[PDB]
Amino acid sequence: PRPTVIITGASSGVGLYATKALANRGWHVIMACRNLEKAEQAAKNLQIPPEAYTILHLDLSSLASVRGFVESFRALNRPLRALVCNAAVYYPLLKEPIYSVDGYEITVATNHLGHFLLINLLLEDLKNSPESDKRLVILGTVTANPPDLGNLEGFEKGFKKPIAMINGKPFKSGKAFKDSKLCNMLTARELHRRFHESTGIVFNSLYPGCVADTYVSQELAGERVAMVVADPEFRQSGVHWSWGKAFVQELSAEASDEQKARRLWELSEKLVGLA
Ligand SMILES: NC(=O)c1ccc[n+]([C@@H]2O[C@H](COP(=O)([O-])OP(=O)(O)OC[C@H]3O[C@@H](n4cnc5c(N)ncnc54)[C@H](OP(=O)(O)O)[C@@H]3O)[C@@H](O)[C@H]2O)c1
Ligand SMILES: [Cl-]
Ligand SMILES: [Cl-]
Ligand SMILES: [Cl-]
Ligand SMILES: [Cl-]
Ligand SMILES: [Zn+2]
Ligand SMILES: [Zn+2]
Numbered sequence: 001p002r003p004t005v006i007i008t009g010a011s012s013g014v015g016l017y018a019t020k021a022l023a024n025r026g027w028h029v030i031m032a033c034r035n036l037e038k039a040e041q042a043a044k045n046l047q048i049p050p051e052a053y054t055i056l057h058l059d060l061s062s063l064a065s066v067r068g069f070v071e072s073f074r075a076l077n078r079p080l081r082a083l084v085c086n087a088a089v090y091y092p093l094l095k096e097p098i099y100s101v102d103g104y105e106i107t108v109a110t111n112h113l114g115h116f117l118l119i120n121l122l123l124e125d126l127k128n129s130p131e132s133d134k135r136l137v138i139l140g141t142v143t144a145n146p147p148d149l150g151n152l153e154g155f156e157k158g159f160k161k162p163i164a165m166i167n168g169k170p171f172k173s174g175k176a177f178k179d180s181k182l183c184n185m186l187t188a189r190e191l192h193r194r195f196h197e198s199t200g201i202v203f204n205s206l207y208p209g210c211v212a213d214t215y216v217s218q219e220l221a222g223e224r225v226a227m228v229v230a231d232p233e234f235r236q237s238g239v240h241w242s243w244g245k246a247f248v249q250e251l252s253a254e255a256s257d258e259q260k261a262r263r264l265w266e267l268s269e270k271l272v273g274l275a
């Protein structure tokens with residue numbers, strides 16, 4: 001009897017050490033990955049036993065792929081205990097936006113909108129599971145409090161070319177990334193508010209520390225993801241765990257983001273075909 005956790009972006013970095021850590025605690029990790037070849041090599045290289053994992057293809061930049069990943073998880077007939085939204089892309093060199101298969105600026109489309117659809121479909125799976133300690137963890141920003149969503153003008157007007165930023169202003173890829181990470185935080189917050197009572201699922205977020213990409217190792221950061229998913233200390237919905245022993249804060253900490261967080265959620269449903 002082995003409890004199931006899905007990890008997005010599990011074939012490298014933090015996601016890969018997180019899957020290692022959770023397997024060592026005796027979990028069965030669904031490595032939901034873009035690149036099946038790299039996922040297979042990585043799994044074997046870290047010496048993880050075949051019972052501890054299953055690789056399923058997931059491309060967060062395609063909503064058809066998010067839907068299809070979900071049907072494939074369901075076919076396993078494994079009760080879901082947890083979900084980790086860890087996958088993040090970042091294209092620092094782009095001067096011009098790239099638009100996903102579904103027509104959305106790719107950074108926001110992958111980091112936010114694809115995780116948004118994934119979360120919303122898997123809530124059904126999460127709420128129907130008979131596991132008692134069910135968590136949904138999102139990798140977010142340093143603190144729950146540069147990114148600026150404005151009045152969401154870009155999302156209000158449908159978020160298609162020529163719109164490449166959530167606030168409807170000219171494309172900036174580094175800001176797009178930060179915007180996207182803000183969306184992840186706002187979404188965690190809003191999952192707690194909308195669903196924690198009705199389901200009893202723990203909805204939290206974390207920041208495992210600054211990590212070597214383009215003061216903390218991938219191994220440790222991955223251990224810290226595992227802690228947030230699995231250990232009794234971290235079993236509390238509505239909060240952000242940060243390593244800068246963790247500082248904890250309420251996801252709803254910043255009161256003036258309340259309206260934004262709600263409007264973000266409603267616009268996101270529209271963008272991914274839930275409304
Ligand atoms: N460095 C910082 O100071 C800083 C700042 C803010 C946030 N963070 C957080 O730290 C975390 C580091 O994560 P990491 O080490 O796992 O990242 P990483 O190894 O540097 O590379 C990106 C990850 O995203 C996955 N991915 C990319 N595109 C995808 C797609 N279209 N569909 C599905 N998966 C995709 C990749 O694996 P596959 O392509 O094989 O799936 C890979 O695991 C991030 O989640 C980020 O939010 C760090
Ligand atoms: Cl597939
Ligand atoms: Cl797929
Ligand atoms: Cl409660
Ligand atoms: Cl759908
Ligand atoms: Zn596939
Ligand atoms: Zn999100």
Ligand SMILES: [Zn+2]
Nearest residue numbers: 196197198200
């Ligand atoms: Zn109650």
Ligand SMILES: [Zn+2]
Nearest residue numbers: 196200236237
């Ligand atoms: Zn509670």
Ligand SMILES: [Zn+2]
Nearest residue numbers: 193252255258
């Ligand atoms: Zn409130």
